[PDB]
Design a binder for this molecule. Structure first.
Ligand SMILES: CCCCCCCCOCCOCCOCCOCCOCCO
Ligand SMILES: CCCCCCCCOCCOCCOCCOCCOCCO
Length: 772
C-alpha cells in the first residue's frame, strides 16, 4: 500500500539505501553493478513498486520483488553462467524483517558472520522462528519459541527456569539485536529463559559453535532475538487473549512517523499477562514495555535510542522440580500433575531492562558503519521455599528448604563494526571488521541462616503450599563478580568463482573475571572461522565449515592441584547441502555435524573419594567429549497458501568415559508445524496444526534411602498442536489455539536434584487481535 517518498538523484548505491529506508524494505544489490550509475528523482506518496521502477529509470536494472525484500540486478546481453552467491550489499544490517512476510522461513540473516546473507549463503546450521509462526502458534515467550524450534529440546529446572539443548549442550549464549549478553551463570542471566515475544520480530538460532560473534560462550548454539523496529507508515494492533487456568494476556503495538516528514519515527509496545497454571498454587504476572525512536540526522546517518523492560513476577515458585522422586523410604512417588512443591509465598521474580543507542552511517563508498551502546540490567528477588528431600515420610510429613537470593547485574557494552565490498582479482568480495567491549557487574545478597523457623509440614499428599514464611535473618553472603570481555573480529567473504564462496575470519578475545574469586584471565585467545559454499545448480549448494568457541570455566572448576581447568572449548565440523526453491520462498537443508569438546569439567571420582590436598575439597578433571549427528530441515511455502517449518535432528554425545552424556536430551527428535490459508469462499480462514516427537530419554539418579543408582526413562512421545484463525473483518480477527491435543502426560525434568517436572497438559488459548 501507498508510501511517502523523497529520494533525489544520487549514486544508485545511496539511492538504494535511501529507498530501503523510506520503504521499510530490504534492498539487496550488487555493488559492482550499480557503481557508475544514478537514480532518477522520486517524489511523494507512491506505491513502493511504482516508486522503485521510477527510481531505477535509466539505470538498466530490474527488480525481483521478494516479500519484505527486493533484489536489484542489471542483466547484460553477455552472462557466461550465473553467480548465485554474488556479493550483495544490503540496506538493513540485521537482515529481512519477517513481520508481514506471511512466511515461516526467514529472508536474510546476519547471525553467522555479521554479513547480510541468505540461509543458502550461510555455511552454518541456521534456524529461524519467524514473526508469523509466532503469531499463528501463540508463542508468546522464548520458552514457547524454543519448544517449537527445530533441533531444540526444552527441559525444566523449575517453574521459572527452563533449559535449552542443542547438539549435546546447554545453550547459554543469547543476543539482542546481535549484541551478546553475559550469561556465565544464573546471576548474570536473570530472565533469559522468560523474554516476552511482544517486542521481537523474530528469533534466530545459530547451532554449532558460535564463537565468531558470541565471543566466549557455550557449545550448541546462540539464540539471537531481533527487536521490532518503527516504520514510515503509521500502524498498530491491540490483542486480547484468554487460556486454560485463568491465563489472560493483552498486548498493544504502535509504530510510525512522529513528524510531518518522517525523519523521526517511533515504535512502542506494552504487553501484560497474569496467569495461573495447571500446577497447584502457582501464578505469574509478566509486564513488558518497549520504546524505540529513530532519528535521521541526514539521509545517510541514523540515530536510534530505545528502552525495554520486562518483569517476571511469580508466586509458588519452586527451587528444583515439581516434586521429589523418592519418598522417605525410597519408593518412587506418584502425584497428580497439579502437584507443586513450592510454597505459596515462594517466588523467583526476575527482571530485565535495557537502554540502548546506536548510530549507523553509510559511507558513500558502499561501506556502512555502526556503533552500538548498551546498558542492561538483569535482576532477581528470589525468596524460594519448596519441599525438598526424600519425602513424604511414612506419617505423611515433609520438610521445606527455604533460601533467599536477591541481586542485580548491570552490563555496559560498546560494539563497533565496518562492512563493505572490495575488488580483488577482478571479482567482488566483502568484509566485516569490528571490535567489542562489555563490562558487567553482578552484586547480590544471599540468605540461608534462618532464625527460628520450623520447616516441617504435616500433610504431603495434600500439600497446598500453605506453610509459614521464615525469618531470613541477616545476609549470609555478598556477591561481587565483574566480567570484562574485549573482542575484535574479521570475516572476509571471497567470491572465488561463480560457484564458490570462501569464508575466512576469526575473533581475538580477552576475558577477565574479577571479584570474590581468584581472577580468571584469558588474553589474546584466537577463534578461527573457515567456511565454504559450492553451488551445484540453480537449486542446491553444498557447504562445509570449521567453527570454534570457548568459555573460561566457573571458578569452582579446579583440579587436584587447586588449579582452574583450562577453558571449556569446542570445534564444530559441519558439512551439508542446502536447497533453495521458489525464489527463496522455500528453504531446505540436510546437515552432518560433529562437535569436538575439550576441557569439559568432570567430577574426579578417585580424588573426591577422599580429598588429600587440603587446599581443594572437591576437584574436577578436564576431559574431552564428542557429538556426532545430523539434521534435516524445511521452511516456507509448500504451496500457495501453505506454509511449514520442520526438522529432524539425530545426536549422540559421548565423553571420555566412553559413556553417553546429555542422556536427557533425546537422541532423535522431529518437529513439523504448518498452517494453510484457504482460497475463495473461505479465504478469511487459516487452519494449522503441528506435531513434535522425541525418542527415549533417561537420567541416572541416586536413590539415597536404598543406596542404589536407578535409571529413569521418558519413553518416546508425541505432542500435537492445532490452530485456527478467522479474519472476520479488515481490522479484526479471532484465533483459537489448542495445545497438546491428546493430553499426553509426560516429563520435562527427571533427576535435577532428585526431583521431577511434568510438561503442560492440554491447554487452550483464545484471542482477538485488532489492527488499526
Ligand atoms: C533515555 C531513555 C530512552 C527512552 C526511549 C523511549 C521511546 C518512547 O517513544 C515512544 C514512541 O512511539 C511512537 C508511537 O508511534 C505512533 C505514531 O502515531 C502518532 C499519531 O498519529 C497521528 C495520526 O496518524
Ligand atoms: C481437559 C480440558 C481440555 C478441553 C478440550 C477442548 C477442545 C475443543 O475445542 C473447541 C473450541 O471451539 C470453540 C469455538 O469458540 C470460538 C472462538 O471464538 C473467539 C471469540 O472471539 C471474540 C470476538 O470479540
Amino acid at each position: 500500500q501507498e508510501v511517502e517518498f523523497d529520494i533525489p538523484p544520487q549514486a544508485l548505491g545511496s539511492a538504494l539505501q535511501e529507498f530501503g529506508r523510506q520503504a521499510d524494505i530490504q534492498v539487496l544489490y550488487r555493488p559492482e553493478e550499480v557503481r557508475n550509475k544514478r537514480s532518477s528523482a522520486i517524489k511523494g506518496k507512491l506505491e513502493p513498486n511504482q516508486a522503485i521502477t521510477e527510481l531505477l529509470r535509466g539505470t538498466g536494472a530490474s527488480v525481483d520483488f521478494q516479500g519484505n525484500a527486493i533484489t536489484i540486478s542489471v542483466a547484460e546481453a553477455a552472462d557466461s553462467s550465473v553467480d548465485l552467491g554474488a556479493t550483495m550489499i544490503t540496506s538493513n544490517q540485521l537482515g529481512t524483517i519477517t513481520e508481514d512476510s506471511g512466511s515461516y522461513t526467514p529472508g536474510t540473516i546476519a547471525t553467522a558472520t555479521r554479513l547480510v546473507l541468505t540461509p543458502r549463503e550461510t555455511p552454518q546450521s541456521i534456524t529461524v522462528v519467524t514473526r508469523q509462526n509466532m503469531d499463528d502458534f501463540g508463542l508468546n515467550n522464548i520458552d514457547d519459541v524454543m519448544r517449537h524450534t527445530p533441533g531444540i529440546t526444552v527441559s525444566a529446572y523449575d517453574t521459572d527456569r527452563n533449559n535449552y539443548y542443542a547438539r549435546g549442550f546447554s545453550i547459554n549464549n543469547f543476543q539482542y539485536d546481535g549484541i551478546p549478553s553475559t550469561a556465565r551463570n544464573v546471576g548474570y542471566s536473570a530472565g533469559n529463559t522468560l523474554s516476552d515475544m511482544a517486542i521481537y520480530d523474530r528469533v534466530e538460532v545459530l547451532k554449532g559453535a558460535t564463537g565468531l560473534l558470541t565471543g566466549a560462550g557455550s557449545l550448541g548454539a546462540t539464540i539471537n532475538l531481533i527487536r521490532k523496529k518503527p516504520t514510515h507508515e503509521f500502524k498498530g494492533h491491540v490483542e486480547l487473549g484468554a487460556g486454560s487456568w485463568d491465563n489472560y494476556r493483552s498486548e498493544l503495538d504502535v509504530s510510525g512517523p512522529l513528524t510531518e516528514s518522517g525523519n523521526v519515527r517511533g515504535r512502542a509496545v506494552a504487553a501484560y499477562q497474569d496467569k495461573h497454571s495447571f500446577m497447584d498454587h502457582y501464578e505469574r504476572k509478566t509486564s513488558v514495555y518497549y520504546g524505540i525512536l529513530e532519528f535521521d540526522l541526514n539521509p545517510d546517518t541514523m540515530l536510534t535510542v530505545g528502552a525495554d523492560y520486562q518483569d517476571n513476577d511469580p508466586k509458588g515458585s519452586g527451587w528444583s522440580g515439581s516434586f521429589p522422586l523418592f519418598d522417605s523410604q525410597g519408593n518412587r512417588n506418584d502425584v497428580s500433575r497439579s502437584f507443586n512443591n513450592g510454597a505459596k509465598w515462594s517466588s523467583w521474580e526476575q527482571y530485565t531492562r535495557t537502554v540502548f543507542a546506536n548510530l549507523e552511517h553509510n559511507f558513500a563508498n558502499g561501506w556502512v558503519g555502526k556503533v552500538q551502546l548498551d546498558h542492561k540490567i538483569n535482576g532477581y528477588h528470589a525468596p524460594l521455599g519448596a519441599i525438598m528431600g526424600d519425602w513424604p515420610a511414612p506419617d505423611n510429613s515433609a520438610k521445606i528448604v527455604a533460601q533467599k537470593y536477591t541481586g542485580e547485574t548491570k552490563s555496559n557494552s560498546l560494539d563497533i563494526y565496518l562492512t563493505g565490498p572490495f575488488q580483488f582479482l577482478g571479482r567482488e568480495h566483502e568484509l566485516v571488521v569490528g571490535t567489542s567491549a562489555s563490562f558487567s557487574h553482578w552484586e547480590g545478597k544471599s540468605y540461608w541462616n534462618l532464625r527460628n523457623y520450623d520447616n516441617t509440614t504435616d500433610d504431603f499428599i495434600n500439600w497446598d503450599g500453605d506453610i509459614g514464611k521464615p525469618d531470613w535473618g541477616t545476609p549470609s553472603q555478598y556477591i561481587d563478580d565483574k566480567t570484562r570481555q574485549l573482542g575484535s573480529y574479521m570475516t572476509a567473504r571471497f567470491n572465488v568463482t561463480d560457484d564458490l564462496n570462501l569464508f575466512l575470519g576469526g575473533r581475538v578475545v580477552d576475558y577477565r573475571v574479577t571479584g570474590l574469586n581468584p581472577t580468571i584471565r584469558e588474553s589474546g585467545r584466537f577463534i578461527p572461522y573457515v567456511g565454504a559454499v559450492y553451488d551445484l545448480n540453480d537449486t542446491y549448494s553444498v557447504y562445509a565449515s570449521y567453527t570454534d568457541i570457548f568459555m573460561p570455566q566457573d571458578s569452582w572448576y579446579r583440579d587436584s592441584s587447586n588449579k582452574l581447568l583450562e577453558p571449556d572449548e569446542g570445534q564444530n565440523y559441519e558439512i551439508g547441502i542446502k536447497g533453495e526453491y521458489l525464489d527463496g520462498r522455500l528453504n531446505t537443508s540436510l546437515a552432518y555435524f560433529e562437535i569436538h569438546e575439550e576441557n569439559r569439567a568432570e567430577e574426579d571420582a578417585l580424588y573426591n573419594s577422599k580429598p588429600t590436598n587440603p587446599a581443594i575439597t572437591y576437584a574436577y578433571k578436564g576431559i574431552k567429549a564428542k557429538t556426532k549427528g545430523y539434521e534435516a530441515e524445511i521452511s516456507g511455502e509448500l504451496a500457495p497458501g501453505w506454509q511449514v517449518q520442520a526438522g529432524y535432528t539425530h545426536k549422540i554425545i559421548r565423553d571420555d568415559s566412553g559413556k553417553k552424556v546429555s542422556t536427557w536430551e533425546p537422541q532423535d527428535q522431529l518437529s513439523l508445524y504448518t498452517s494453510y490459508k484457504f482460497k475463495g469462499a473461505l479465504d478469511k480462514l487459516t487452519v494449522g496444526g503441528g506435531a513434535r516427537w522425541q525418542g527415549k530419554s533417561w537420567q541416572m539418579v541416586y536413590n539415597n534411602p536404598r543406596s542404589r543408582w536407578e535409571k529413569f526413562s521418558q519413553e518416546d512421545y508425541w505432542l500435537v498442536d492445532l490452530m485456527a484463525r478467522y479474519q472476520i473483518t479488515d481490522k479484526l480477527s479471532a484465533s483459537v489455539n489448542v495445545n497438546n491435543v491428546f493430553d499426553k502426560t509426560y516429563y520435562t525434568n527427571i533427576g535435577f536434584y532428585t526431583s521431577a517436572s511434568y510438561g503442560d497438559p492440554r491447554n487452550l488459548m483464545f484471542s482477538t487481535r485488532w489492527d488499526f
